[PDB]
Amino acid sequence: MKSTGIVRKVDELGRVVIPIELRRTLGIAEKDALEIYVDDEKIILKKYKPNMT
Template sequence: MKSTGIVRKVDELGRVVIPIELRRNLGIAERDPLEIYVAEGQIILQKYQPNGEREDVTKGLEKLKALVSSTDKDVLERAIKLIK
């Protein structure tokens, strides 16, 4: 996984602000639903996609695994399992 170098604090209501740059890059707009996954002490936020679109996401992650380091491959593999 690649670090963005961005750090945010959790507010008194448990909210975390996702910076506009990240939302723009990931195509996340106001009121878009996000799914929350937990894997080995990590919280993974993902733009919600109905079941049919999940297959497209997992295929894309499988292709991405071929391009990243072994550490990132492990993280991607865990994410793929969570999505399925």
């Protein structure tokens, strides 16, 4: 499990329903955060750094 090549809708408020399977791949969650970047034209979602002090 990795790249799916799978499209999703951005829902309504601007939240893209990132499939549970994918966020399972990165081991993120809904209450989790994603550190988003963009490579010129494309979006890069990393999982938020789980650094809790």
